[PDB]
Amino acid sequence: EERLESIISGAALMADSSDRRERIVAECNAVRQALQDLLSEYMGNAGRKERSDALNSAIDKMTK
Amino acid sequence: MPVFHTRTIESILEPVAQQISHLVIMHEEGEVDGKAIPDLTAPVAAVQAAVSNLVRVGKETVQTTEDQILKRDMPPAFIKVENACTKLVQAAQMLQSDPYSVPARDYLIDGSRGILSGTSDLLLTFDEAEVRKIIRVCKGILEYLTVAEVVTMEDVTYTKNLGPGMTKMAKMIDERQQELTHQEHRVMLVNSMNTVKELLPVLISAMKIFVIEEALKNRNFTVEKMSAEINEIIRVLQL
């Protein structure tokens, strides 16, 4: 009777109390970082729009 | 609409993807022609370590996880990531032996895309796992409702043993919609969930009102509708 509700409540239906996700995401950020450098360095600081990039960053600072 | 269904995935992969777009339009424009490319062996080493850590972390999760779908789907992503990493290495080498290498332009692009593609897969696979967690709870509450057509006050202790579960779910959906990047999807989750919790009291009350034949169907109906919403949630969770 009351064990039925528990026989299925055992399917993760309680509090959680208390890293893998943040870890994974962390490492994925690591990869993103290294890869982004590698490409900013190949291209070099030439050609691309870097001023409109600064402003956009300052602009959404008056917001974000 | 958006390309990455998650605010986290997108925050990480959108830049890289765009950055790769800059390059293609450049090479295509000849902005880098006759130019000597600085030694990239160090940067590629960076990526090689970074990828190595990620894979190591992935390999751990695939081992210590209880999710069977997860166990079979992550490993490929590691391969993709690692091979990509190899194209970048070669590219580094071809530009060290020839700073003006044009062919080397192809394994750099192919490598970069490989890393991005491989990473997204790993990330997408993990998210799917995360979703199955939410779906797990939900499917529970659905079963827990099925156990309503078999309840005197002697057998609402039932409503008491439900309170916590209903909270875990409400938390998962709430925190989940804050992450989706498809606005439609979010509204659906939020509406459905709202309906579930509004309809909770009505369910407990429909059960007390069980104290003939009419009180029965006013109850059966309520579990139907609550189930429809919860099923709606599960569906939207997978889009």
UniProtKB/Swiss-Prot annotation, chain A:
Associates with the cytoplasmic domain of a variety of cadherins. The association of catenins to cadherins produces a complex which is linked to the actin filament network, and which seems to be of primary importance for cadherins cell-adhesion properties. Can associate with both E- and N-cadherins. Originally believed to be a stable component of E-cadherin/catenin adhesion complexes and to mediate the linkage of cadherins to the actin cytoskeleton at adherens junctions. It comes from Mus musculus (Mouse). Expressed in cerebellum, heart, liver, small intestine, kidney and placenta (at protein level). It is found in: Cytoplasm, Cytoskeleton; Cell junction, Adherens junction; Cell membrane; Cell junction. Belongs to the vinculin/alpha-catenin family. The chain holds residues 306 to 373 of 906 of the full protein. Sumoylated. Phosphorylation seems to contribute to the strength of cell-cell adhesion rather than to the basic capacity for cell-cell adhesion. It comes from the Eukaryota. This is Catenin alpha-1. The gene is Ctnna1. Residues 19-64 are annotated as: Interaction with alpha-actinin. Monomer and homodimer; the monomer preferentially binds to CTNNB1 and the homodimer to actin. Component of an cadherin:catenin adhesion complex composed of at least of CDH26, beta-catenin/CTNNB1, alpha-catenin/CTNNA1 and p120 catenin/CTNND1. Possible component of an E-cadherin/ catenin adhesion complex together with E-cadherin/CDH1 and beta-catenin/CTNNB1 or gamma-catenin/JUP; the complex is located to adherens junctions. The stable association of CTNNA1 is controversial as CTNNA1 was shown not to bind to F-actin when assembled in the complex.
UniProtKB/Swiss-Prot annotation, chain B:
Residues 166-206 are annotated as: Talin-interaction. It comes from the Eukaryota. It comes from Mus musculus (Mouse). This is Vinculin. Exists in at least two conformations. When in the closed, 'inactive' conformation, extensive interactions between the head and tail domains prevent detectable binding to most of its ligands. It takes on an 'active' conformation after cooperative and simultaneous binding of two different ligands. This activation involves displacement of the head-tail interactions and leads to a significant accumulation of ternary complexes. The active form then binds a number of proteins that have both signaling and structural roles that are essential for cell adhesion. The N-terminal globular head (Vh) comprises of subdomains D1-D4. The C-terminal tail (Vt) binds F-actin and cross-links actin filaments into bundles. An intramolecular interaction between Vh and Vt masks the F-actin-binding domain located in Vt. The binding of talin and alpha-actinin to the D1 subdomain of vinculin induces a helical bundle conversion of this subdomain, leading to the disruption of the intramolecular interaction and the exposure of the cryptic F-actin-binding domain of Vt. Phosphorylated; on serines, threonines and tyrosines. Acetylated; mainly by myristic acid but also by a small amount of palmitic acid. Actin filament (F-actin)-binding protein involved in cell-matrix adhesion and cell-cell adhesion. Regulates cell-surface E-cadherin expression and potentiates mechanosensing by the E-cadherin complex. May also play important roles in cell morphology and locomotion. Transmembrane segments: none annotated. The modification N6-acetyllysine is found at K171. Belongs to the vinculin/alpha-catenin family. The modification Phosphoserine is found at S97. Exhibits self-association properties. Part of a complex composed of THSD1, PTK2/FAK1, TLN1 and VCL. Interacts with APBB1IP, NRAP and TLN1. Interacts with SYNM. Interacts with CTNNB1 and this interaction is necessary for its localization to the cell-cell junctions and for its function in regulating cell surface expression of E-cadherin. Interacts with SORBS1. Interacts with SYNM. Interacts with CTNNA1. Binds to ACTN4; this interaction triggers conformational changes. Interacts with FLII. It is found in: Cell membrane; Cell junction, Adherens junction; Cell junction, Focal adhesion; Cytoplasm, Cytoskeleton.
